[PDB]
Amino acid sequence: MNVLVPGIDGMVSAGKFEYSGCCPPDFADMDECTLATSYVGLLPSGPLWDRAKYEAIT
Amino acid sequence: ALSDGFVRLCIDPSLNFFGEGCKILVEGQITDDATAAENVVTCVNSELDLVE
């Protein structure tokens, strides 16, 4: 038979689901490197920005 | 010549901006503190460069 585990309602039987993969990223995934260079993509595009946006380092 | 730019156009503007189609010469005396050489015509840019 199953192996019972402690629970708020006494001894019950536990189990697991199967991985879904639809979890939004949590605080942990966010990093300064992650988005510090990201906003370089919010600027417009043209001859005045192409070189500058390409040479961005962090 | 922009490598990552668009194909058909390349503006390439000039470094400065003025026409100097006509010229004016101002002659006068200076003081000891002046660094400019005497009796040699030189071009004047702006008031920020004066005094010295």
mmCIF file with all atom_site columns, C-alpha atoms in Angstrom:
data_model
loop_
_atom_site.group_PDB
_atom_site.id
_atom_site.type_symbol
_atom_site.label_atom_id
_atom_site.label_alt_id
_atom_site.label_comp_id
_atom_site.label_asym_id
_atom_site.label_entity_id
_atom_site.label_seq_id
_atom_site.pdbx_PDB_ins_code
_atom_site.Cartn_x
_atom_site.Cartn_y
_atom_site.Cartn_z
_atom_site.occupancy
_atom_site.B_iso_or_equiv
_atom_site.pdbx_formal_charge
_atom_site.auth_seq_id
_atom_site.auth_comp_id
_atom_site.auth_asym_id
_atom_site.auth_atom_id
_atom_site.pdbx_PDB_model_num
ATOM 1   C CA . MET A 1 1  ? 0.000  0.000  0.000   1.00 0.00 ? 1  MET A CA 1
ATOM 2   C CA . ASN A 1 2  ? 0.925  3.677  0.101   1.00 0.00 ? 2  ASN A CA 1
ATOM 3   C CA . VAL A 1 3  ? 3.221  5.276  2.680   1.00 0.00 ? 3  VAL A CA 1
ATOM 4   C CA . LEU A 1 4  ? 1.391  7.888  4.728   1.00 0.00 ? 4  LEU A CA 1
ATOM 5   C CA . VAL A 1 5  ? 2.896  11.304 5.460   1.00 0.00 ? 5  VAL A CA 1
ATOM 6   C CA . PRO A 1 6  ? 2.039  13.768 8.267   1.00 0.00 ? 6  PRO A CA 1
ATOM 7   C CA . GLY A 1 7  ? -0.662 16.285 7.450   1.00 0.00 ? 7  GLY A CA 1
ATOM 8   C CA . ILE A 1 8  ? -2.853 18.919 9.040   1.00 0.00 ? 8  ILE A CA 1
ATOM 9   C CA . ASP A 1 9  ? -5.721 16.399 8.987   1.00 0.00 ? 9  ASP A CA 1
ATOM 10  C CA . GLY A 1 10 ? -3.581 13.516 10.301  1.00 0.00 ? 10 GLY A CA 1
ATOM 11  C CA . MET A 1 11 ? -1.751 10.861 8.298   1.00 0.00 ? 11 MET A CA 1
ATOM 12  C CA . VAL A 1 12 ? -2.470 11.114 4.563   1.00 0.00 ? 12 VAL A CA 1
ATOM 13  C CA . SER A 1 13 ? -0.979 9.910  1.280   1.00 0.00 ? 13 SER A CA 1
ATOM 14  C CA . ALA A 1 14 ? 0.965  12.388 -0.856  1.00 0.00 ? 14 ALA A CA 1
ATOM 15  C CA . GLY A 1 15 ? 1.823  12.532 -4.539  1.00 0.00 ? 15 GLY A CA 1
ATOM 16  C CA . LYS A 1 16 ? 3.184  14.707 -7.320  1.00 0.00 ? 16 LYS A CA 1
ATOM 17  C CA . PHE A 1 17 ? 1.870  16.262 -10.518 1.00 0.00 ? 17 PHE A CA 1
ATOM 18  C CA . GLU A 1 18 ? 3.691  16.490 -13.859 1.00 0.00 ? 18 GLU A CA 1
ATOM 19  C CA . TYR A 1 19 ? 5.673  19.573 -14.815 1.00 0.00 ? 19 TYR A CA 1
ATOM 20  C CA . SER A 1 20 ? 3.595  22.195 -16.639 1.00 0.00 ? 20 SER A CA 1
ATOM 21  C CA . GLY A 1 21 ? 6.043  24.981 -17.494 1.00 0.00 ? 21 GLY A CA 1
ATOM 22  C CA . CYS A 1 22 ? 3.590  27.909 -17.403 1.00 0.00 ? 22 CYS A CA 1
ATOM 23  C CA . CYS A 1 23 ? 5.062  29.729 -14.388 1.00 0.00 ? 23 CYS A CA 1
ATOM 24  C CA . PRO A 1 24 ? 5.884  33.430 -14.839 1.00 0.00 ? 24 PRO A CA 1
ATOM 25  C CA . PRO A 1 25 ? 9.478  34.288 -13.917 1.00 0.00 ? 25 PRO A CA 1
ATOM 26  C CA . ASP A 1 26 ? 9.952  35.017 -10.221 1.00 0.00 ? 26 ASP A CA 1
ATOM 27  C CA . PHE A 1 27 ? 12.132 37.611 -8.490  1.00 0.00 ? 27 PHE A CA 1
ATOM 28  C CA . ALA A 1 28 ? 15.020 35.138 -8.633  1.00 0.00 ? 28 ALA A CA 1
ATOM 29  C CA . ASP A 1 29 ? 15.348 35.125 -12.425 1.00 0.00 ? 29 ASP A CA 1
ATOM 30  C CA . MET A 1 30 ? 15.595 38.920 -12.608 1.00 0.00 ? 30 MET A CA 1
ATOM 31  C CA . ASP A 1 31 ? 19.179 40.196 -12.675 1.00 0.00 ? 31 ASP A CA 1
ATOM 32  C CA . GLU A 1 32 ? 20.902 43.508 -13.330 1.00 0.00 ? 32 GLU A CA 1
ATOM 33  C CA . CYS A 1 33 ? 22.680 42.068 -16.372 1.00 0.00 ? 33 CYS A CA 1
ATOM 34  C CA . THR A 1 34 ? 19.320 40.708 -17.538 1.00 0.00 ? 34 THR A CA 1
ATOM 35  C CA . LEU A 1 35 ? 17.684 44.090 -18.139 1.00 0.00 ? 35 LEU A CA 1
ATOM 36  C CA . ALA A 1 36 ? 20.469 46.685 -17.875 1.00 0.00 ? 36 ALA A CA 1
ATOM 37  C CA . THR A 1 37 ? 21.400 46.076 -21.518 1.00 0.00 ? 37 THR A CA 1
ATOM 38  C CA . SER A 1 38 ? 17.765 45.374 -22.446 1.00 0.00 ? 38 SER A CA 1
ATOM 39  C CA . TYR A 1 39 ? 16.568 48.994 -22.607 1.00 0.00 ? 39 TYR A CA 1
ATOM 40  C CA . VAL A 1 40 ? 19.094 49.690 -25.366 1.00 0.00 ? 40 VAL A CA 1
ATOM 41  C CA . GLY A 1 41 ? 16.283 48.230 -27.484 1.00 0.00 ? 41 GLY A CA 1
ATOM 42  C CA . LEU A 1 42 ? 13.779 50.935 -26.491 1.00 0.00 ? 42 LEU A CA 1
ATOM 43  C CA . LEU A 1 43 ? 15.638 53.614 -28.464 1.00 0.00 ? 43 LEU A CA 1
ATOM 44  C CA . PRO A 1 44 ? 14.824 54.468 -32.096 1.00 0.00 ? 44 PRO A CA 1
ATOM 45  C CA . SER A 1 45 ? 16.756 53.140 -35.099 1.00 0.00 ? 45 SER A CA 1
ATOM 46  C CA . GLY A 1 46 ? 18.828 55.033 -37.636 1.00 0.00 ? 46 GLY A CA 1
ATOM 47  C CA . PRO A 1 47 ? 22.331 56.121 -38.636 1.00 0.00 ? 47 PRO A CA 1
ATOM 48  C CA . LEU A 1 48 ? 22.613 58.126 -35.397 1.00 0.00 ? 48 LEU A CA 1
ATOM 49  C CA . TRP A 1 49 ? 22.036 55.083 -33.149 1.00 0.00 ? 49 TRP A CA 1
ATOM 50  C CA . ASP A 1 50 ? 23.199 51.972 -35.025 1.00 0.00 ? 50 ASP A CA 1
ATOM 51  C CA . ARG A 1 51 ? 26.876 52.258 -34.095 1.00 0.00 ? 51 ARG A CA 1
ATOM 52  C CA . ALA A 1 52 ? 26.170 53.374 -30.525 1.00 0.00 ? 52 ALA A CA 1
ATOM 53  C CA . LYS A 1 53 ? 23.671 50.582 -29.863 1.00 0.00 ? 53 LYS A CA 1
ATOM 54  C CA . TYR A 1 54 ? 26.049 47.970 -31.291 1.00 0.00 ? 54 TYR A CA 1
ATOM 55  C CA . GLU A 1 55 ? 28.995 48.947 -29.059 1.00 0.00 ? 55 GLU A CA 1
ATOM 56  C CA . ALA A 1 56 ? 27.041 48.640 -25.789 1.00 0.00 ? 56 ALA A CA 1
ATOM 57  C CA . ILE A 1 57 ? 28.929 46.712 -23.101 1.00 0.00 ? 57 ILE A CA 1
ATOM 58  C CA . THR A 1 58 ? 28.193 46.044 -19.444 1.00 0.00 ? 58 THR A CA 1
ATOM 59  C CA . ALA B 2 1  ? 29.899 54.902 -45.017 1.00 0.00 ? 1  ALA B CA 1
ATOM 60  C CA . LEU B 2 2  ? 27.681 53.282 -42.378 1.00 0.00 ? 2  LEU B CA 1
ATOM 61  C CA . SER B 2 3  ? 28.041 49.511 -42.144 1.00 0.00 ? 3  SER B CA 1
ATOM 62  C CA . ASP B 2 4  ? 24.795 48.821 -40.259 1.00 0.00 ? 4  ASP B CA 1
ATOM 63  C CA . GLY B 2 5  ? 22.830 51.653 -41.890 1.00 0.00 ? 5  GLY B CA 1
ATOM 64  C CA . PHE B 2 6  ? 20.408 51.564 -44.789 1.00 0.00 ? 6  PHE B CA 1
ATOM 65  C CA . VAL B 2 7  ? 21.404 50.965 -48.408 1.00 0.00 ? 7  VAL B CA 1
ATOM 66  C CA . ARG B 2 8  ? 20.416 53.852 -50.632 1.00 0.00 ? 8  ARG B CA 1
ATOM 67  C CA . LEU B 2 9  ? 21.592 56.990 -48.790 1.00 0.00 ? 9  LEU B CA 1
ATOM 68  C CA . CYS B 2 10 ? 24.689 58.159 -46.913 1.00 0.00 ? 10 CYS B CA 1
ATOM 69  C CA . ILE B 2 11 ? 24.415 61.733 -45.651 1.00 0.00 ? 11 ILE B CA 1
ATOM 70  C CA . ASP B 2 12 ? 27.978 62.443 -44.502 1.00 0.00 ? 12 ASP B CA 1
ATOM 71  C CA . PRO B 2 13 ? 27.556 65.998 -43.145 1.00 0.00 ? 13 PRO B CA 1
ATOM 72  C CA . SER B 2 14 ? 30.440 68.442 -42.966 1.00 0.00 ? 14 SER B CA 1
ATOM 73  C CA . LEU B 2 15 ? 32.295 69.175 -39.739 1.00 0.00 ? 15 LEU B CA 1
ATOM 74  C CA . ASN B 2 16 ? 31.574 72.914 -39.425 1.00 0.00 ? 16 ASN B CA 1
ATOM 75  C CA . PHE B 2 17 ? 28.808 75.302 -40.495 1.00 0.00 ? 17 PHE B CA 1
ATOM 76  C CA . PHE B 2 18 ? 29.329 78.749 -42.040 1.00 0.00 ? 18 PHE B CA 1
ATOM 77  C CA . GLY B 2 19 ? 29.846 80.370 -45.428 1.00 0.00 ? 19 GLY B CA 1
ATOM 78  C CA . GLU B 2 20 ? 32.553 83.027 -44.981 1.00 0.00 ? 20 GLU B CA 1
ATOM 79  C CA . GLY B 2 21 ? 31.522 84.543 -48.295 1.00 0.00 ? 21 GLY B CA 1
ATOM 80  C CA . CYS B 2 22 ? 32.727 87.955 -47.090 1.00 0.00 ? 22 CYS B CA 1
ATOM 81  C CA . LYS B 2 23 ? 35.472 89.016 -44.696 1.00 0.00 ? 23 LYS B CA 1
ATOM 82  C CA . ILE B 2 24 ? 36.089 91.953 -42.360 1.00 0.00 ? 24 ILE B CA 1
ATOM 83  C CA . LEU B 2 25 ? 39.435 93.125 -40.967 1.00 0.00 ? 25 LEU B CA 1
ATOM 84  C CA . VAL B 2 26 ? 39.725 94.988 -37.654 1.00 0.00 ? 26 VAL B CA 1
ATOM 85  C CA . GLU B 2 27 ? 42.964 96.827 -36.863 1.00 0.00 ? 27 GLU B CA 1
ATOM 86  C CA . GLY B 2 28 ? 43.968 98.270 -33.516 1.00 0.00 ? 28 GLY B CA 1
ATOM 87  C CA . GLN B 2 29 ? 46.409 98.241 -30.627 1.00 0.00 ? 29 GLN B CA 1
ATOM 88  C CA . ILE B 2 30 ? 46.891 95.617 -27.919 1.00 0.00 ? 30 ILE B CA 1
ATOM 89  C CA . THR B 2 31 ? 48.505 95.429 -24.478 1.00 0.00 ? 31 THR B CA 1
ATOM 90  C CA . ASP B 2 32 ? 51.465 93.522 -23.065 1.00 0.00 ? 32 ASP B CA 1
ATOM 91  C CA . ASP B 2 33 ? 49.344 90.648 -21.743 1.00 0.00 ? 33 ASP B CA 1
ATOM 92  C CA . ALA B 2 34 ? 48.210 89.724 -25.263 1.00 0.00 ? 34 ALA B CA 1
ATOM 93  C CA . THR B 2 35 ? 49.596 86.445 -26.603 1.00 0.00 ? 35 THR B CA 1
ATOM 94  C CA . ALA B 2 36 ? 48.783 87.009 -30.283 1.00 0.00 ? 36 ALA B CA 1
ATOM 95  C CA . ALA B 2 37 ? 51.722 87.797 -32.551 1.00 0.00 ? 37 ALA B CA 1
ATOM 96  C CA . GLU B 2 38 ? 52.010 91.388 -33.736 1.00 0.00 ? 38 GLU B CA 1
ATOM 97  C CA . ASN B 2 39 ? 51.593 92.429 -37.371 1.00 0.00 ? 39 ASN B CA 1
ATOM 98  C CA . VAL B 2 40 ? 50.249 88.994 -38.370 1.00 0.00 ? 40 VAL B CA 1
ATOM 99  C CA . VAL B 2 41 ? 46.673 88.596 -39.591 1.00 0.00 ? 41 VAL B CA 1
ATOM 100 C CA . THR B 2 42 ? 44.769 85.942 -37.642 1.00 0.00 ? 42 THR B CA 1
ATOM 101 C CA . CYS B 2 43 ? 41.191 84.690 -37.657 1.00 0.00 ? 43 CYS B CA 1
ATOM 102 C CA . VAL B 2 44 ? 38.818 85.346 -34.750 1.00 0.00 ? 44 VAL B CA 1
ATOM 103 C CA . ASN B 2 45 ? 36.314 82.680 -33.700 1.00 0.00 ? 45 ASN B CA 1
ATOM 104 C CA . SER B 2 46 ? 34.163 83.942 -30.813 1.00 0.00 ? 46 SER B CA 1
ATOM 105 C CA . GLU B 2 47 ? 34.149 86.181 -27.756 1.00 0.00 ? 47 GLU B CA 1
ATOM 106 C CA . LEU B 2 48 ? 35.124 83.273 -25.492 1.00 0.00 ? 48 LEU B CA 1
ATOM 107 C CA . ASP B 2 49 ? 38.597 83.341 -27.070 1.00 0.00 ? 49 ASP B CA 1
ATOM 108 C CA . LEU B 2 50 ? 39.146 87.088 -26.526 1.00 0.00 ? 50 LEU B CA 1
ATOM 109 C CA . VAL B 2 51 ? 40.970 88.845 -23.660 1.00 0.00 ? 51 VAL B CA 1
ATOM 110 C CA . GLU B 2 52 ? 43.735 86.237 -23.612 1.00 0.00 ? 52 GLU B CA 1
#
